[PDB]
Amino acid sequence: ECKTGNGKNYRGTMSKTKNGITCQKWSSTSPHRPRFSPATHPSEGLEENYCRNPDNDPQGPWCYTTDPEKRYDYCDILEC
Ligand SMILES: NCCCCCC(=O)O
């Protein structure tokens, strides 16, 4: 939805990257094994396949992708 700062606290439901590719579920290990996930990062709200900023990357909320050749990509939430 709307994001503030780096979207650290973003809890919106975008599920596709800025490029229109659908995100992979954090709880999943295919096509990509996540290094960030609910088991390991309990407080980051890594729900489903939603865009999240677990590492606070300055480019914003991102997600693992369903493209075996694109491990992760940033999504476009609008600035609150
Ligand atoms: N800064 C976003 C990308 C982090 C890489 C993702 C990972 O391999 O856990």
With a 6 Å cutoff on the Cβ, whether 36 touches ligand 1 is yes
Range of the domain at 57: 1-80
74 lines ligand 1 (CB under 6 A): no
How many domains in the chain? 1
Give the C-alpha separation, 7 to 27, whole Å: 20
In this structure, the residue with its CA closest to atom 8 of ligand 1 is 35
How is residue 7 written in tokens? 């979207």
Centre of ligand 1 to C-alpha 52, Å, is 11
Using what technique was this structure determined?
Answer: X-ray
Question: Can you tell me which residue has the tokens 């075996």?
Answer: 68
Resolution (A): 2.1
Burial class (CB in 10 A: 0-12, 13-18, 19+), 58: exposed
C-alpha angle with apex 34: 60 to 73, nearest 5 degrees? Answer: 35
Per DSSP, the residues of the chain read: -EE-TTTTT------B-TTSPBBPPTT--SSS--SS-TTT-TTS---TT--B-TT--TT--EEEEEETTEEEEE--PEE-
Minimal-distance CA residue to ligand 1 atom 9: 35
Q: Cβ(21)–Cβ(14) under 8 Å?
A: no
Token output for 66: 């369903």
Question: What is the domain-level CATH number for residue 61?
Answer: 2.40.20.10
